[PDB]
RNA sequence: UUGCCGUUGCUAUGGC
RNA sequence: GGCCCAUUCGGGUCUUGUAAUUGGAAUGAGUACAAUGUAAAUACCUUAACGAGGAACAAUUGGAGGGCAAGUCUGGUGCCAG
């Protein structure tokens, strides 16, 4: 009854935890019970993960948010107070949620793909992201599928990454879900299979969608740290 | 298991008489069980002979079959050919059981003394006390069949008959 | 070609199993287990310690100060030593006596301190295998082992007992019998920096104990002849060798599982390998071990082989065929009984009955680059293992030890770049298990100490 | 069921000494003699065709 | 004489706890004797005897070994907070009965 | 011993079945509670009495 | 420097 | 004296029998201390104490053949046949 992304062992139970509503969707997130209890194993059961949630160790996106099924989606920096645990969780190359450990100056921010820019009411420019941070007043040159950098103390955009040909992009969606390498090709079609294409070890080619891909930095310099093997 | 084709011919009756008497068996079901799975084994080895040399099935399943037959212990280390699996037979299989092996190693005086030692738990291969007589010891567990350390024929405290006789003679 | 087809089909099979280096190469389960690895405790006992003391060619060899302190005990059998983090040593003999030494006076011969001699007084009054709880040895003490902390020495032999003596007084604090009739102990080894003893008993059994709790941990089974030697390091692994089954096993003792390593040298293929252009042959019995580090060990055989084995290869990595020579052939005045030298020479059959010396002692200094081999060739040999860990090589010899070497081990001194060691070796005129040894050529029952430097 | 086959096999291998001549294990001690008789008229050998 | 072996000791700061697997060794004894085992565990580790706890005991066939799950706390009060109520009924001090109706 | 409860249960059922037809009803009553039997057991005992389908005798 | 015994050194060896 | 073959006469073979006495060992079903397990309880696992001579702590089912009475019945060319 589980998805593939959670890295959930089959010998666990019968009812799978539906995440509650929140920032991200159901299909692109993992809740805190499947995060803490059975992935990096700070708990043994739902009772004691509710106990540490009542103790309020979790500090995801700089706020506490004491809830069992809180849908932590892409790169919400899970922060735990004891042993200064800073966790940025991204996608691995085979579809799961690889939770990388980072440090404090990297967990002081996150980034987010812009979805739409609106002239909503009363002359106010407007920007949303995958956690829905409706932050005030970016520059006019925010296209769709660019990348804002959230402040995580206040909410303001601090840095901006422009989407164009020659940018380091992350793909979350479809049969390319979780690949990095961002350059063999660029092809913007007019309604589907439109993208920037991603290399491999032998620099192979790949096809995805615009909304299923979003930028993380430059060719060699992302200010996100990434795990390795 | 499964019953044979003609179960009541006189050669079969004298066969089962010799087998049950020479190996201390309780009924026909021991012979019929071990012969049923031996029938499966060499019915498979017959097909492995009816296919040809350099067949993948023959190469891999043949050396797999003779190596796990050698490790059960019914086949010696040097005959690594597949026609010896056809030459194999039923008392080569029930010489490997623990009652036969306890008697042959000499912890018992007969196969019936071996059967009652095993069912009274004085015999342990390796670490665990084995207590059923038809156990099919392997070529590595062949040399650790010894008296259990929980038993008066090992070194343990003597049983109830010995200690009650000692107490009544102390009275 | 059938083996070629087997190799080819196995290669295709492994390729198909793979079917069912990029810039991003991170795996979620591996990094999660590495987070648990960052979370855990006890990076102390379980070091998979490699060879960190590379000093084989460094120290001197040829001018050791060799003192052969002869003692009046028939057929010394074992040697146990001790260093804290004054040093004591222990010997034991076939005359049922344990003897404590001080050894820390490094530039001179060791000093006797205390006897502890069992005898016929300690035969139990029962002949019953579980009331073997006497306080002394009545038969053939074969092995001593000093504690890594030094509170106790623990010894045992063919009287199927483990008597644990205190260090400061040589008094029997506790007796633990091995509870069966053939339960003679043959080798003892503490795991390093601990209180856990591994005894190897001739029931094809390995018993383990905690000495300061007077308890037995685990009995572990699985050799096929008598477990003639044992060896351990700081890890809870152990390495035993049974004699004639020609296999050496190493035991994950908490898991109670093992890795077996058989021998497998054949004079047919070996004489063909020489025939491509010679007195070397098959194997009798693997006899002695010492775990050099937590990935390699070395075995001493019955045909004079010394072999070097890894943790990742069944067959051995390196051999050394003749390690102490071949024995002097029996004389023509002691073979035949004819009159003429021609027939008494015909009764030698040429070279067919020359038998090699068998290595009866082997000691690898733990995690170091150098080990010491000993038999009744009169000369101990010192070998260093090459830094790529795929070979060893004879450095030099220590030729002041006339007799069988029933035990070798070393005693350390000096700091990280300047070091000096005294190699103790128990010397007898008789093998430590049975007699079997003729042509006692100037042997004496002593302690061969050598002081090696630099 | 086990003791019955123990005692009908002992009966069978006591009857087998009657029909054949069973190899008992060779000469025990000193050769005392045939202990039962020698028949000079009987030949218990299988003739061909 | 029972014998004790801890393995795979990790620390849980979120639950203020230190947890491990417990190989309990009793040759020629019956079984683990859990209160005596809590005594032996509380003296091999530090004092906290009402903050050390074991729950998952499985003895292998033929006796001798048993694997349990050991978790030891500092601060007996937060041990009472974090442990479940049935184990507190089993070992410690808590006792609240369920209302028996229907 | 619920083991011996089940053993004597089966033995009484078989010995009762040799005296009545093979497949008669042996009923099991537990301990008396407050002067009389458990009313669950007496309820389905009366359920067994209510369907019995008597056959006519001769005398 | 030892179970005796010999050379001993004023310490090393060799016969049981 | 037992056993085996054979239509017959007979032949072949050999330590074989006996409600004969007797001896100390073994333990398992059962009865049961517990502890473990588990929300709790059952069960599995581990386990001290007792537990065999008709070891009565009393396994069946089916077959082949006799032999006996101051006995009974039938037939009829005594004492027989059935």
């Amino acid at each position: 009854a589980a998805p593939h992304h959670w890295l959930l062992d089959k010998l666990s139970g019968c009812y799978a935890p539906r995440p509650s509503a929140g920032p991200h969707k159901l299909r692109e997130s993992l809740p805190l019970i499947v995060f803490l209890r059975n992935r990096l194993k700070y708990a043994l059961n739902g009772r004691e993960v509710k106990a540490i949630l009542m103790q309020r160790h979790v500090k995801v996106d700089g706020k506490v948010r004491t809830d069992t099924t809180y849908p932590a989606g892409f790169m919400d920096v899970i922060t735990l107070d004891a042993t200064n645990e800073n966790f940025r969780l991204v996608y691995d190359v085979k579809g799961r949620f690889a939770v990388h450990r980072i440090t404090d100056e990297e967990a002081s921010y996150k980034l987010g793909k812009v979805k739409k820019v609106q002239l909503g009411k009363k002359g106010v420019p407007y920007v949303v992201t995958h956690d829905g941070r409706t932050i005030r007043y970016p520059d006019p040159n925010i296209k769709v599928n660019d990348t804002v950098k959230i402040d995580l103390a206040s909410g303001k955009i601090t840095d901006f990454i422009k989407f164009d040909a020659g940018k380091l992009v992350y793909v979350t969606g479809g049969r390319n879900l979780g690949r990095i390498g961002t350059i063999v090709h660029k092809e913007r079609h007019d309604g589907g299979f439109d993208l920037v294409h991603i290399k491999d070890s032998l620099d192979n080619t790949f096809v995805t969608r615009l909304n299923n891909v979003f930028v993380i930095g430059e060719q060699g310099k992302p200010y996100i740290s990434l795990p390795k093997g | 298991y499964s019953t044979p084709k003609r179960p009541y011919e006189s050669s079969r009756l004298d066969a089962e008489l010799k087998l049950a008497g020479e190996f201390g068996l309780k009924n026909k079901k021991e012979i019929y069980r071990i012969s049923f799975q031996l029938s499966k084994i060499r019915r498979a080895a017959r097909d492995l002979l009816t296919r040809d040399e350099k067949d993948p099935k023959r190469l891999f399943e043949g050396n797999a079959l003779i190596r796990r037959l050698v490790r059960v212990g019914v086949l010696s280390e040097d005959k690594k050919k597949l026609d010896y699996v056809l030459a194999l037979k039923v008392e080569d299989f029930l010489e490997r059981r623990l009652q036969t092996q306890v008697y042959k190693l000499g912890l018992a005086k007969s196969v019936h003394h071996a059967r009652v030692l095993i069912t009274q738990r004085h015999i342990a291969v390796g670490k665990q006390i084995v207590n059923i007589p038809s156990f099919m010891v392997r070529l590595d567990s062949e040399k650790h069949i010894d008296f259990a350390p929980t038993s008066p024929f090992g070194g343990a405290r003597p049983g109830r008959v010995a200690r009650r006789n000692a107490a009544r003679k102390a009275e | 070609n059938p083996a070629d087809k087997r190799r080819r089909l196995a290669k295709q099979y492994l390729e198909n199993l793979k079917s069912e280096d990029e810039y991003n190469n991170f795996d979620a389960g591996d990094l999660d287990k590495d987070i648990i690895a960052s979370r855990l405790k006890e990076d102390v006992a379980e070091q998979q310690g490699r060879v960190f003391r590379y000093f084989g060619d460094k120290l001197l060899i040829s001018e050791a100060k060799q003192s052969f302190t002869r003692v009046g005990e028939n057929n010394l059998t074992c040697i146990s030593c001790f260093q804290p983090v004054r040093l004591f040593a222990y010997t034991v003999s076939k005359d049922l006596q344990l003897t404590k030494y001080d050894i820390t006076d490094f530039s001179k011969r060791p000093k006797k301190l205390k006897y502890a001699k069992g005898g016929a007084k300690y035969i139990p009054t029962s002949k019953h295998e579980y009331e073997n709880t006497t306080e002394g040895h009545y038969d053939e003490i074969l092995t001593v082992a000093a504690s890594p902390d030094g509170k106790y020495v623990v010894t045992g032999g063919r009287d199927r007992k483990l008597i644990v003596w205190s260090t400061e007084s040589l008094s029997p604090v506790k007796v633990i019998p091995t509870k069966d009739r053939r339960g003679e102990v043959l080798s003892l080894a503490f795991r390093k920096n601990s209180d856990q003893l591994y005894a190897s008993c001739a029931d094809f059994k390995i018993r383990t104990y905690s000495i300061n709790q007077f308890s037995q941990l685990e009995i572990l089974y699985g050799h096929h002849d008598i477990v003639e030697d044992i060896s351990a390091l700081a890890m809870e692994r152990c390495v035993t060798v049974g004699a004639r089954d020609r296999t050496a096993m190493l035991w994950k003792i908490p898991d109670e599982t093992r890795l077996t390593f058989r021998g497998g040298d054949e004079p047919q293929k070996l004489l063909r390998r020489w025939m491509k252009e010679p007195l070397f042959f098959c194997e009798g019995s693997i006899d002695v071990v010492s775990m050099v580090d937590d990935f390699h060990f070395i075995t001493g055989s019955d045909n004079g082989n010394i072999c070097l084995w890894s943790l990742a290869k069944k067959k051995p990595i390196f051999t050394e065929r003749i390690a102490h020579g071949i024995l002097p052939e029996p004389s023509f005045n002691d073979i035949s009984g004819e009159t003429d030298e021609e027939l008494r020479k015909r009764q030698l059959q040429g070279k067919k009955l020359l038998q090699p010396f068998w290595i009866t002692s082997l000691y690898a200094i733990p995690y170091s680059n150098v080990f010491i081999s000993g038999s009744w060739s009169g000369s101990l040999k010192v070998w260093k293992i090459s830094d790529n860990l795929r070979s060893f090589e004879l450095l030099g010899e220590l030729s002041g030890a006339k007799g069988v070497v029933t035990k070798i081990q070393v005693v350390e001194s000096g700091k990280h770049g300047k070091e000096k060691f005294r190699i103790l070796a128990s010397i007898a005129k008789e093998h430590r298990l049975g007699r079997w040894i003729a042509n006692v050529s100037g042997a004496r029952n002593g302690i061969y100490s050598a002081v090696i430097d630099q | 069921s086990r003791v019955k086959k123990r005692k009908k096999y002992q009966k069978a291998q006591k009857k087998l000494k009657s029909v054949r001549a069973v190899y008992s294990g060779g000469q025990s001690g000193v050769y005392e003699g045939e202990k039962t008789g020698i028949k000079k008229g009987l030949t218990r050998s299988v003739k061909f065709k | 004489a029972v014998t004790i072996r801890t393995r795979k000791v990790i620390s849980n700061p979120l639950l203020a706890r230190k947890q491990f697997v417990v190989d309990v060794l009793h040759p020629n004894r019956a079984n683990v004797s859990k209160d005596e085992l809590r005594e032996k565990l509380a003296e091999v580790y530090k004092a906290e005897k009402d903050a050390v706890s074991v729950f998952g005991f499985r003895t292998q066939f033929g006796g001798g070994k048993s694997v349990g799950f050991g978790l030891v706390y500092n601060s007996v009060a937060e041990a009472k907070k974090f442990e479940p109520t049935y184990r507190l009924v089993r070992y410690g001090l808590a006792e609240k009965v369920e209302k028996a109706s229907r | 011993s619920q083991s011996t409860l089940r053993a004597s249960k089966k033995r009484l059922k078989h010995r009762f079945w040799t005296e009545v037809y093979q497949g008669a009803k042996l009923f099991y009553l537990s301990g008396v509670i407050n002067g009389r039997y458990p009313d669950r057991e007496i309820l389905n005992l009366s359920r067994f009495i209510s369907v019995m389908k008597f056959r006519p005798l001769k005398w």
Side-chain angles (χ1 to χ4, degrees):
Chain A
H4 187 269
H5 323 277
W6 290 352
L7 198 72
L8 191 68
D9 290 334
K10 264 162 59 162
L11 326 170
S12 62
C14 73
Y15 271 93
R18 270 88 190 189
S20 60
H24 313 253
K25 298 184 202 43
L26 279 198
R27 303 269 82 190
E28 39 192 40
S29 63
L30 50 77
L32 267 77
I33 198 162
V34 75
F35 181 74
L36 283 86
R37 174 187 59 173
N38 54 69
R39 184 193 269 277
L40 76 159
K41 290 155 179 173
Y42 272 117
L44 318 172
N45 47 354
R47 167 189 179 272
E48 71 194 52
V49 67
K50 189 48 173 181
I52 56 189
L53 275 153
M54 285 179 182
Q55 213 274 355
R56 306 159 70 251
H57 292 276
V58 290
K59 280 305 301 199
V60 49
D61 289 19
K63 325 285 177 42
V64 49
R65 305 167 187 280
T66 171
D67 191 280
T68 64
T69 47
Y70 186 57
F74 205 81
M75 65 201 311
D76 311 279
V77 282
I78 318 298
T79 293
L80 293 72
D81 290 328
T83 63
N84 49 47
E85 308 276 87
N86 295 34
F87 287 114
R88 171 165 269 116
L89 50 93
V90 301
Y91 280 12
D92 50 359
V93 298
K94 43 190 61 68
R96 285 90 60 106
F97 269 92
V99 47
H100 181 47
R101 185 179 177 87
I102 54 171
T103 176
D104 295 299
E105 64 267 54
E106 200 180 347
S108 46
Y109 73 100
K110 77 188 289 288
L111 52 84
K113 152 195 166 191
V114 48
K115 274 74 182 163
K116 56 183 193 50
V117 191
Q118 284 271 19
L119 63 161
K121 267 193 282 186
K122 302 296 115 168
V124 165
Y126 179 84
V127 56
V128 297
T129 173
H130 39 82
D131 37 341
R133 317 282 292 277
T134 55
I135 308 303
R136 301 280 79 80
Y137 300 148
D139 58 278
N141 261 308
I142 307 284
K143 269 75 185 176
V144 192
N145 322 287
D146 302 76
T147 317
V148 303
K149 170 177 162 307
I150 310 296
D151 174 72
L152 261 71
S154 68
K156 71 181 181 71
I157 304 163
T158 77
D159 287 31
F160 151 71
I161 307 302
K162 179 82 168 47
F163 157 66
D164 60 3
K167 272 273 171 57
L168 174 61
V169 83
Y170 212 116
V171 44
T172 78
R175 282 192 281 110
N176 301 6
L177 187 139
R179 209 160 294 122
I180 286 297
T182 197
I183 304 295
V184 194
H185 188 220
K186 286 92 190 190
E187 213 283 330
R188 276 91 66 200
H189 202 245
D190 42 356
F193 38 92
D194 35 1
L195 69 146
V196 59
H197 304 246
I198 294 95
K199 60 103 176 181
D200 295 69
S201 176
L202 56 92
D203 274 27
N204 214 25
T205 41
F206 274 113
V207 192
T208 177
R209 299 279 303 267
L210 300 151
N211 47 345
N212 275 313
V213 80
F214 85 114
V215 186
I216 58 168
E218 280 82 8
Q219 273 68 18
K221 318 280 299 214
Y223 42 92
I224 312 294
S225 62
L226 273 82
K228 67 106 177 179
Chain B
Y1 82 111
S2 283
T3 43
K5 297 291 187 300
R6 324 189 57 190
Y8 285 132
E9 61 167 20
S10 299
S11 64
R12 188 160 285 276
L13 301 180
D14 292 306
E16 296 161 358
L17 174 61
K18 187 177 178 64
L19 288 176
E22 191 180 359
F23 295 89
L25 314 178
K26 196 185 56 202
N27 51 7
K28 299 180 301 189
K29 282 185 72 173
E30 277 102 7
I31 305 105
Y32 288 172
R33 204 178 300 121
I34 197 62
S35 68
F36 168 69
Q37 55 193 354
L38 160 71
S39 90
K40 282 195 290 180
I41 283 174
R42 64 179 182 177
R43 184 183 307 249
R46 191 263 176 281
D47 303 336
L48 261 66
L49 264 301
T50 203
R51 64 183 65 250
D52 46 317
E53 204 66 60
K54 320 300 193 198
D55 207 70
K57 180 74 70 70
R58 178 167 182 177
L59 297 149
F60 292 115
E61 297 219 329
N63 86 318
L65 176 57
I66 63 184
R67 276 184 85 262
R68 60 199 44 191
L69 270 194
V70 160
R71 291 195 275 111
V72 167
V74 304
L75 198 47
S76 93
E77 270 97 327
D78 58 353
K79 32 184 73 179
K80 288 296 186 54
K81 294 210 256 198
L82 207 52
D83 54 357
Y84 292 97
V85 191
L86 306 172
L88 211 63
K89 62 174 70 175
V90 54
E91 64 265 17
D92 298 328
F93 262 91
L94 44 78
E95 278 178 353
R96 294 307 301 168
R97 44 190 271 155
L98 185 56
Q99 162 172 5
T100 307
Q101 287 297 100
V102 160
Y103 162 62
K104 292 271 201 52
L105 294 171
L107 313 182
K109 268 165 282 298
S110 51
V111 289
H112 302 274
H113 188 202
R115 181 141 190 154
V116 307
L117 279 172
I118 289 169
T119 58
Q120 286 165 359
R121 303 172 181 181
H122 305 281
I123 296 296
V125 313
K127 193 185 68 170
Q128 296 252 310
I129 287 178
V130 199
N131 83 310
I132 83 153
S134 70
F135 182 58
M136 308 282 150
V137 313
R138 317 153 84 253
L139 210 63
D140 54 354
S141 316
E142 193 182 0
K143 288 202 60 180
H144 311 77
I145 312 165
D146 207 11
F147 279 116
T150 324
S151 71
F153 307 135
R157 192 266 311 271
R160 49 166 164 168
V161 166
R163 72 167 160 249
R164 175 186 51 202
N165 293 12
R168 285 203 256 105
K169 288 174 66 178
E171 192 265 319
Chain C
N1 210 327
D4 300 4
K5 191 166 169 171
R6 274 168 181 138
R7 271 150 195 204
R8 189 254 286 182
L9 283 171
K11 208 157 293 163
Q12 298 184 358
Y13 171 76
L14 291 171
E15 283 164 20
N16 269 101
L17 288 185
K18 290 193 317 210
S19 279
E20 303 206 353
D21 313 348
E22 212 184 25
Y23 159 71
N24 47 348
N25 53 2
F26 49 95
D27 168 81
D30 214 317
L31 54 87
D32 289 355
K33 187 183 56 55
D34 268 347
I35 290 317
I36 309 300
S38 161
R39 204 157 79 187
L40 53 85
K41 186 220 204 298
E42 179 80 330
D43 44 0
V44 173
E46 46 266 58
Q47 276 76 247
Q48 299 267 43
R50 291 205 170 275
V51 192
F52 82 105
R53 212 183 269 118
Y54 277 161
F55 74 112
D57 46 3
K58 191 253 156 186
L59 79 163
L60 299 165
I61 180 66
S62 49
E63 56 270 15
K65 294 164 287 291
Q66 312 154 349
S67 44
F68 176 60
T69 169
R70 39 197 269 164
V71 68
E73 286 289 306
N74 262 313
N75 317 130
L76 289 180
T77 308
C78 198
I79 273 292
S80 199
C81 310
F82 173 61
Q83 292 97 8
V85 191
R86 39 165 83 98
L87 324 170
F88 313 118
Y90 298 93
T91 201
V92 78
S93 87
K94 296 204 189 184
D95 299 354
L96 279 298
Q97 194 184 278
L98 169 63
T99 311
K100 184 173 181 179
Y101 294 150
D102 206 40
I103 198 188
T104 187
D105 201 354
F106 209 87
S107 158
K108 56 174 287 300
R109 87 210 182 276
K111 280 304 286 291
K112 176 166 303 200
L113 267 75
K114 269 168 300 179
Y115 81 110
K117 181 185 195 75
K121 315 294 291 175
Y122 287 123
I123 286 183
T125 172
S126 86
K127 181 60 96 191
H128 201 43
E129 269 294 339
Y130 83 114
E131 41 192 350
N132 203 16
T133 60
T134 179
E135 303 94 25
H137 287 73
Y138 50 93
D139 200 354
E140 193 41 51
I141 326 173
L142 294 180
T143 39
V144 283
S147 300
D149 65 276
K151 276 185 304 191
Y152 307 100
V153 76
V154 184
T155 193
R158 298 204 166 170
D159 47 326
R160 68 209 61 91
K161 277 201 307 300
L162 268 303
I163 299 287
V164 45
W165 311 72
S166 74
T167 289
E168 74 272 13
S169 46
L170 258 64
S171 71
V173 195
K174 185 61 166 56
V175 46
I176 298 179
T178 52
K179 304 177 310 300
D180 71 328
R181 196 198 66 248
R182 321 161 306 167
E184 313 153 68
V185 285
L186 275 76
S187 294
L188 266 74
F190 280 91
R191 57 180 298 265
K192 303 306 164 58
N193 294 116
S194 76
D195 40 354
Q196 296 193 356
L197 172 65
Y198 302 154
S200 70
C201 322
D203 319 340
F204 326 108
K205 276 179 195 44
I206 312 293
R207 301 183 154 82
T208 55
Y209 301 92
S210 69
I211 304 308
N212 53 4
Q213 264 289 94
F214 299 135
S215 44
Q216 41 169 343
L217 275 289
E218 283 168 352
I219 174 63
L220 63 159
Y221 306 83
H223 262 285
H224 167 279
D225 206 26
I226 66 178
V227 278
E228 195 165 85
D229 198 29
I230 205 164
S231 159
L233 294 187
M235 202 168 240
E236 218 163 4
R237 269 154 176 77
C238 169
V239 173
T240 71
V241 50
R244 208 162 261 273
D245 46 353
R246 303 179 290 273
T247 179
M249 293 157 179
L250 72 95
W251 309 88
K252 262 185 80 186
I253 290 174
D255 194 19
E256 288 180 347
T257 42
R258 87 186 95 96
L259 304 170
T260 191
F261 302 90
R262 309 205 176 273
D265 48 355
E266 292 88 5
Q268 273 317 97
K269 73 182 198 71
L270 262 42
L271 269 297
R272 191 254 164 273
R273 170 67 53 87
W274 197 88
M275 181 142 286
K276 84 187 168 313
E277 292 190 7
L279 195 76
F280 50 92
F281 55 88
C282 76
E283 208 278 331
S285 156
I286 314 286
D287 283 0
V288 282
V289 281
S290 276
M291 202 197 298
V292 46
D293 56 324
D294 275 24
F295 288 90
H296 287 59
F297 55 88
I298 43 171
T299 51
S301 163
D302 216 345
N303 47 341
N305 294 124
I306 309 183
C307 290
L308 162 77
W309 310 74
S310 51
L311 257 284
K313 283 194 166 305
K314 312 174 185 298
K315 285 191 153 298
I317 277 187
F318 188 50
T319 182
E320 170 79 5
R321 308 299 310 281
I322 285 289
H324 287 264
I326 316 174
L327 276 146
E329 51 92 23
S331 62
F332 308 108
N333 299 322
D334 277 331
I335 176 65
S336 163
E338 293 266 334
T339 56
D340 69 302
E341 193 43 83
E342 201 269 348
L343 288 188
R344 300 177 309 206
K345 273 189 207 318
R346 203 152 145 93
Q347 293 324 297
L348 263 294
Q349 297 164 287
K351 317 181 69 184
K352 298 194 179 307
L353 54 91
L354 322 168
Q355 298 294 307
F357 292 82
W358 63 68
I359 167 172
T360 175
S361 294
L362 174 134
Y363 187 78
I365 310 169
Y367 314 103
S368 90
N369 222 27
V370 52
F371 56 93
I372 302 105
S373 72
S375 71
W376 62 99
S377 199
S379 48
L380 273 74
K381 306 219 169 178
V382 158
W383 319 71
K384 79 167 172 66
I385 178 166
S386 81
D387 280 350
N388 75 317
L389 296 167
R390 261 83 56 102
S391 290
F392 57 88
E393 192 35 74
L394 198 155
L395 292 180
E397 308 199 11
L398 262 60
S399 298
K402 294 297 295 310
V404 290
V405 194
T406 81
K407 199 59 165 172
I408 304 175
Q409 55 195 20
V410 308
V411 163
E412 283 214 300
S413 158
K415 303 292 281 196
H416 301 72
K418 280 296 294 170
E419 56 264 0
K420 45 183 308 179
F421 317 95
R422 57 187 321 191
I423 305 177
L424 294 193
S426 177
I427 307 302
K429 55 180 65 163
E430 168 180 328
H431 196 278
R432 64 166 283 250
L433 299 168
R435 287 179 158 266
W436 309 309
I437 295 303
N439 199 33
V440 184
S441 298
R444 303 276 321 173
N445 297 155
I447 293 95
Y448 171 78
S449 176
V451 194
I452 204 74
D453 219 340
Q454 167 164 344
Chain D
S1 160
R2 177 184 49 88
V3 188
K4 179 67 146 36
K5 295 158 181 40
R6 162 165 163 84
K7 297 171 87 65
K8 70 190 290 291
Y9 174 67
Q10 283 176 22
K11 276 194 56 180
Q13 74 173 13
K14 278 170 194 186
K15 295 192 219 279
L16 190 64
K17 292 221 302 165
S18 280
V19 280
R20 290 170 35 211
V22 174
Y23 171 73
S24 290
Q27 176 185 323
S28 55
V30 193
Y31 177 60
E32 293 180 352
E34 264 305 291
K35 276 172 55 197
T36 193
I38 291 172
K39 300 209 163 211
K40 80 178 193 194
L42 195 66
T43 82
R44 299 197 59 100
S45 72
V46 179
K47 316 276 201 38
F48 286 83
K49 64 213 155 295
Chain E
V2 80
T3 321
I4 184 72
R5 184 170 64 218
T6 187
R7 289 180 317 155
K8 281 158 305 203
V9 181
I10 73 165
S11 44
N12 205 339
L14 275 78
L15 285 154
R17 202 174 72 180
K18 187 179 283 186
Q19 52 194 358
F20 53 92
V21 69
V22 198
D23 304 347
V24 188
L25 285 82
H26 40 274
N28 69 20
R29 291 194 74 231
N31 51 6
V32 286
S33 301
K34 146 190 293 171
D35 302 338
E36 291 86 357
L37 188 44
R38 256 154 167 143
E39 299 302 344
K40 180 154 286 308
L41 215 45
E43 62 200 305
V44 61
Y45 279 137
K46 307 326 298 190
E48 53 255 21
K49 198 256 157 181
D50 205 358
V52 58
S53 174
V54 290
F55 47 88
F57 280 129
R58 285 310 190 275
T59 307
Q60 49 190 37
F61 274 70
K65 288 191 67 188
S66 312
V67 157
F69 286 145
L71 78 174
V72 59
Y73 291 86
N74 49 357
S75 175
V76 180
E78 85 196 341
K80 281 164 41 63
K81 168 212 200 308
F82 278 140
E83 283 276 352
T85 179
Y86 64 92
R87 202 165 320 134
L88 287 158
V89 162
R90 278 184 212 175
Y91 163 66
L93 56 96
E95 181 67 28
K96 167 174 175 178
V97 307
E98 203 92 5
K99 171 182 148 216
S101 159
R102 296 281 196 171
Chain F
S1 282
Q2 201 259 342
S3 60
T4 72
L5 204 52
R6 256 186 289 184
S8 309
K9 192 155 306 177
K10 292 182 104 163
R11 280 199 270 100
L12 284 181
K13 168 179 53 196
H14 301 329
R15 197 54 186 93
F16 185 81
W17 277 13
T18 70
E19 303 293 319
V20 196
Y21 40 87
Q22 183 135 329
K25 198 60 211 178
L26 192 67
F27 208 93
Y28 306 108
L29 295 195
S30 315
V32 55
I33 44 172
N34 196 294
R36 76 275 189 195
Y37 283 124
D39 205 52
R40 175 79 268 177
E41 281 168 336
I42 304 298
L43 199 151
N44 50 10
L45 171 62
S46 282
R47 194 189 163 183
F48 265 104
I49 300 178
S50 49
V51 49
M52 215 51 192
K53 207 171 182 176
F54 286 3
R55 54 186 74 248
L57 288 166
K58 176 158 196 299
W59 187 257

